[model samples]
Each structure stands twice: as structure tokens, then as C-alpha cells.
Target chain A: VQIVYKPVDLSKVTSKCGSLGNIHHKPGGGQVEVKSEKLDFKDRVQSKIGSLDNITHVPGGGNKKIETHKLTF
Target chain B: VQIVYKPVDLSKVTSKCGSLGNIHHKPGGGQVEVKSEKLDFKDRVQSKIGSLDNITHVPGGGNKKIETHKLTF
Candidate 1:
């Protein structure tokens, strides 16, 4: 998937352009990608494929992806 | 002065475009802005004068200014 950041309306319409393809799938089907992470939440790596503008570059040399997640009813 | 994010070359002229006006005088001259911070570093309020791209906007609603400091010898 293209990992599009879209916010969907409550079972009605979505404000997104759906440019990455409409995601009308049922709940948690393709939406949920469960991960087996450490209990402390460490050693877990997450990633996002989006614009560089939504990311952060720490001065020391670390980066964080900005949140572009959306939801629906 | 605008807080340009330019890396300085040791004891030499900055590789910067000098777009924000050259900062060449001597040592720590007009290059130092002493701050009277609390001993615990709690009340140390700092800021930058630059574009929004050089800053960070936290998810919950906190912002941080990106570092863009340079110096000469």
C-alpha cells in the first residue's frame, strides 16, 4: 500500500482526496497491522512513507515521522 | 540576526552564503547572548528567528525551533 495519510468521515464521506485509492475496507481488516513488540515499547521500529515536510530532523541526527493518521466510525 | 542553520568551519570563514549578513569580528563578539538561566535549567527560555520549516510542531501542540547557530574564531 502507499501508506496514504487520510482522515475519513464517520461512515459517510472522507475529506481526503483518496488519491492513493479509496479505502472503504471494513474495520481493522487492512487497517490493522499488528506488531509483536517488546513489553516496554523499546526495540520496536515504526516507519512511514510520506513527504519529508512531515518529518523531524534532530540537530544531533535523529528523525521522527509526523502523524498523518486518520480514522472513521 | 536571523538564526541561519549554517555549519561553521573551524577558525575560518563560514561556508554559509552570508545571506544573513556576515558575522566576522573576532571571538564571541556579538556572537554571545548570555542567558541567566535557573541553576536547574528549568526557566531557560530560548528562541530562534527563522522560517517555520526550521521548527517543529509536536503532535499534541508543542513547537521547537531548529538550531541554526554558527561561530568564528
Candidate 2:
């Protein structure tokens, strides 16, 4: 539940990190709980997620057991 | 340069990683070389970058010196 900020110019030192989690499940078959946590870009709500190293996906599922991770570069 | 594939059903285990780098510069002012390396989603071209944990942005620049990272969750 922390807030991160990305700098705009090469003037000062500024960086950040964050996390997001959610649960998605079907009646009696599929169940997926998604999560993600990493750095942020700036104070803008539009791109709160950083643009230089974002941790986009991390999933946990299975009857109710699955701890896996995925990333973009 | 590896290929990752995201599974469609809850049958098997599959995951992957990748990296992307590029240099963006102006004539006599700004210069930025971006690099990113992490996991991928599937074999598809659209979401090649994983949806669960993607390393979105990593930047390096300056007169030619800047190493920074960003992430999303």
C-alpha cells in the first residue's frame, strides 16, 4: 500500500514501488487470484505504474493453490 | 531472445522471460537508452509480455549515464 513516483528530468533522484492484488473465480471450476507489485513512474494516476521496469503480472490459482510470477521487458 | 507461452487451461505448468533494449536520442540535447528483461505471457505476438509479471520499463541515459527501473502491479 505504498506510493511510488517517477522523476521527469535528470535533476534529482526519485523512484518508487507498489503492489496490486485481485481474485477472479468461476462457479465450480476456474479460480484465479492475480497480484502485481513493483516500482512506479510518477504522480500521475494515468501512468502511476512506472514506464522503466513495471512488474505487470503475478498469479496464484488452482483449486486454491498457485503461486506464480510473470514479467515484461 | 526466447519464446514464452501462456497456458489456456489448468493442465500444465508453463512460464518464461525476455528482454528489450533501445536507444532514443536527440541531436544536441537529450539521450536515453532503454533496456528491459523479464518473463513473458505466451507465444502470442500481442501479449508476448506476460500478463502476470511483466518488467515494463528500465531506462539508462544522461550525457550517456542513467540506470533506472520501473514496474506495474
Candidate 3:
């Protein structure tokens, strides 16, 4: 599935997702979760966040595949 | 393959990628590219952007797999 961030704002990156408390940067790289909540989508837009059930890491820097649930919401 | 954003910022989410200028938000619920350029990575960290060569969409909100090139730079 295509991952699209609606109304994509560099400033409101974390704010748009109202449920999530805050989005923070990790020590080395990437972002870390400041708060945890149930992964719920408002049922209007389509997203792949729910499809990210399992994640596997490769040895070096490269491309990775994300396995997703087959059913529709 | 892993996708990691270095010095990630909700503010500078789009800026870090030097070549890609000014990431803008989409109207529906996603971000659109303001500019397109070669996906280049410095000789430091690991990332999965290169792996996203092929992408397919699934109905509803769910997980998806990304096909990536296996060669290392």
C-alpha cells in the first residue's frame, strides 16, 4: 500500500496524528515514541500504518519490504 | 532494509533531504513532493528509500511490502 501523509507539514508532523502524544527524534537516528496509544485510524483516509504488523531489519543499508494485512478496513 | 530519518524533526521532516526541497502536505491526507531529485545518501547511515523501487496498493488500511535493489554502494 502507498504511504501518504495528508496535509504534510514539516511543522505539524506529529500534531496531525491527534491520538499520538508526540513524535521525538531518537538518539542515533529516526524517531522514537514519546507516548503509546491504540493504532486507530479515523476511517476516512487510507494508510499503511495498520499494515506494519512485523518489521525485519536487513544487515546493511538498503530496501526492505513491509508485510501487511490482506483484508480491507 | 530500514528507513531511518537522521536528525528527524517534525519541523524539518522534509528539509534534511537536501536535494528534495520543501516538502509540502497534500490536501486529502498525505504529503506531496514539491521537487524531485536523485535519492542520494551520504556514506554514513543506513536507509531503505532505495529499496522502494516497486510499490503496490492494498485495499483498506494495511501493511505492504516494498521491493528494493540488493546492491550496496
Candidate 4:
């Protein structure tokens, strides 16, 4: 069995935060192509919100600190 | 090799869309705890923004259609 992974199209992904704001790709409101690895996509989000230190991760996730993992997407 | 998955803290995940708005878990601006699987997270964002049908995935990611996979976070 051969496993294959597909890249995520950033443009297609849209998110909203409690009616506070909306998220999408740039250049135009309707047309654009942004493709990258899942990690890269994650980076885009983190970059927008300032340093991770500014973030408050709730505890009880097996540890009191944020943990990182390397996995296939 | 041993692998442990730590759930994501939704409250700590802040996102901004072109400065149009900001995203974070609800309730008081500073305190709240939201934790769940990465897929559940993807779903929460999707729920906020409407349907995947409204999403436009860019081409050249191995296929013209969106694909899903069981990824370990």
C-alpha cells in the first residue's frame, strides 16, 4: 500500500472567529492560488497572532506547557 | 518509537485576516479553555465560515479537487 499526501490550498481555507473577523488568502477577494505544506499554513496563522508567548494554552493537555510533534499531514 | 498526541488549545490559537478581524476562543477576552482534536478544530473553523462548497481550493496540488486524510497531530 502506497500512502500519498496532498497539499492544502490556503486560498480555499476560510475561518471566522466568533463574528469578530474572517480569514482568507490575499491579492483579490475571489481569485488567487496559495499552496503550501500544512506546517507552512500553520506558520501563517501563528505569525499573524504575534509570538506564541502571547498565546495562552490551557493546561491539562498531559503537560502544563505547549508540546510539539512531527507528523505526516 | 513512542508517540503521544497532545490536543490543541483553541483559546491560544489566535488568527487575523488581513487585519479585518481577529480570532480567539469566546467569553472574556483573556480567560477560557477550549481543547480538542486537530480535526475537530478544522471543523470549528469551517463551521464559523460556512460550507466547504463556498471554499475555492487552488489547483496544482496533485488534483483539482479537495482531498482528505487521516493525519496524526
Candidate 5:
């Protein structure tokens, strides 16, 4: 599908961090979260969508590295 | 395939109200904004997308209902 602009404000490029998406923090640092995908032509969209149910790097998901370097006081 | 929760906070239910999305304000009142759609299998992914470009009531795109009031100072 052809992506179209919605007459959004000019701040979209000025305020936004390059892309129109939110920032997500992870174990290391922050990450961008833009949830948009281009539609495919002359192809099936069901099975392709069904496979996205198992995303790993989602906002509240990922391999957690829970460890600390402090001692009890 | 199956949808897997991102192990998000239980506050999702308490804070998110009902659906997992943001809020949108309109002329009448505040509207809920949940943007997720089920995928369709055994169908082409194009052409259908062309139709969405003309949708009204979108966040930044829609018909405006401008009006006037009687007041002077």
C-alpha cells in the first residue's frame, strides 16, 4: 500500500526523534517503537499477521538480565 | 499462532481502562483509541489498503465542524 501523510503538523519532524514513534527503554538504553508495516500486494495477510503474535522485543518483553552489584547494608 | 502478553504491569488493566491504546479527543467528547486489527488469510493485501487512505475521523484528518458564538467585549 502507498503510505499517505495526514497533513500532520510540521513539528512531526522537528519534535519527533527523526521518526514518528515513541521511545522505549531497555536493559541497556532507549529504543524506538514505531508500529507500522507496509501492506503486501497480491499476497495473503493472514498467516503473516498470525506469526507476529510472538514478538520478543516488545515494550514490556525481552530477555531480562536481572543482576545487581550492590551489597546488603 | 498465538498472541503472547509482554508481561506488562497489571496496571494495564487498571490504568488502560479497557483497551490497550491511547485517548483521542473530538468535538463531542473523549474517544478511546485502540488501533489493532485482525488479519485476513487467503486474501490479497493490496487494493484493500488503497481504500484506507480515504478514511475520515482519523486523528489528524477529518471534516471540521467550525462554528461561531455571540460575544463581544
Candidate 6:
């Protein structure tokens, strides 16, 4: 099922998140995945996901979902 | 009669004491006079006579005496 874990804030989603989705969530009960359009030093993933491989989903049941949500400070 | 006050330490009197007398003694109850042959940084006067003019005694009873003595340390 489609479940938005968190809300996305449009202001925080600068041009940096233009290409990539704003909110991120794990499908089923797995790891979460979030992506960014712009590659910059200041651009960071605010989550427990330590590395890219840990967050990026594989396929089918292992797939992570990205949703638009309000961003918090 | 001439009264030799104190003995001079020969070993202490290096080539630095060539021109000037080794032992310096105050004449009567005046200042004492001691001179050195060589002029070097290490050449120093170890006595009550502070300066030059105050040390060299005049003729007669004002003259200071120099007596050579055995060296200790």
C-alpha cells in the first residue's frame, strides 16, 4: 500500500530537490530511500540511512518509496 | 715594616694577571689596587675595590700592596 511516512515542505525543497522526490519511505518494513536533483556539499539526507546503498531500494519487495512531504527545520 | 694582609691564590691568577700584581691589599686603611696584563672578557677583579681610580693608591702611605700566595682550590 502507499503510505506517506512524513509531510514535505515546499520551501525547504529548493531547486536541489527538483529532479528527486521530497519525502522518502521504505516499502513494507525495509529501509527508506531519498534522492536529490542537485549535487551539492550542503545537500544532505536527514535520516538514519548512513550511506547511499543502505537507502536506495533494490526491486519488488525491497523497493524503497519516495513521496512529496512538508520539510521541517 | 710592610704588612702583607692576605695571601694570593696563584692558580687563580692566570696569564690575565700578568701586568697587574696578583694579590691586592689596601694601604693603611684605604682601597686596594690590582691590575691585569691581558685584557679579555673573563679578566675580572674580585675584591672590595669597585672601580679603577678608587683602587690605584698614591705614593707614600696611600699605596696598596700586592703579595703572591699559594693557591687552594
TM-score, per-candidate, Cα-based = 0.13, 0.12, 0.13, 0.13, 0.12, 0.11
Question: i-RMS values of the candidates, in order?
Answer: 27.4, 26.9, 25.3, 22.0, 26.6, 52.5
Off by over 4 Å in 3: A1-73, B1-36, B50-73
Q: Which is better, 1 or 5, measured by TM-score? A: 1
- As for TM-score, the candidate ahead, 2 or 3, is 3
- Could you say which candidate leads in DockQ? 4
Candidate 1, which segments miss by more than 4 Å at Cα? A1-27, A31-73, B1-59
DockQ of every model listed? 0.01, 0.03, 0.04, 0.05, 0.03, 0.00
Candidate 5 lDDT, A38-59, residue by residue in tens: 4333454432221112111212
| Error at B9, model 3, angstroms | 40
- Which residue runs of candidate 2 sit more than 4 Å off their true CA positions? A1-31, A34-73, B1-53, B62-73
Please report how far candidate 6 places residue B21 from its true position, in Å. 40
lDDT of 3 by residue, A25-57 (tens): 222212222223333333343332211122222
Fnat: each model in turn: 0.01, 0.03, 0.07, 0.04, 0.04, 0.00
As for TM-score, the candidate ahead, 5 or 6, is 5
lDDT of 2 at A18: 33
For model 6, what is the alpha-carbon lDDT of residue A55? 69
User: Candidate 5, which segments miss by more than 4 Å at Cα?
Assistant: A1-8, A13-45, A48-54, A59-73, B1-73
User: Which residue pairs show collisions in model 3?
Assistant: A5-B30, A5-B31, A6-B29, A6-B30, A8-B25, A51-B62, A51-B63, A63-B51, A68-B63
Q: Is candidate 5 or candidate 6 better by DockQ?
A: 5
Return the DockQ of model 2: 0.03
lDDT of 6 by residue, B1-73 (tens): 5555575465543232224445555433234357767644455755443443436553322334576666443
Candidate 5: CAPRI quality band: incorrect
Predicted candidate 1 versus true structure: per-residue lDDT over B1-73, tens digit per residue: 2323323222211111111211222211121122332222123333321111212322212233233222442
lDDT of 1 by residue, A1-73 (tens): 1223323322211121112222121211111122332222123333321111222322211222222222332
Per-residue C-alpha lDDT of model 4 across residues B1-73, encoded as one tens digit per residue: 4434434332332232223242233221222223322322322132221111222322111212222334463
In model 1, what is the error at residue A59, expressed in angstroms?
A: 22
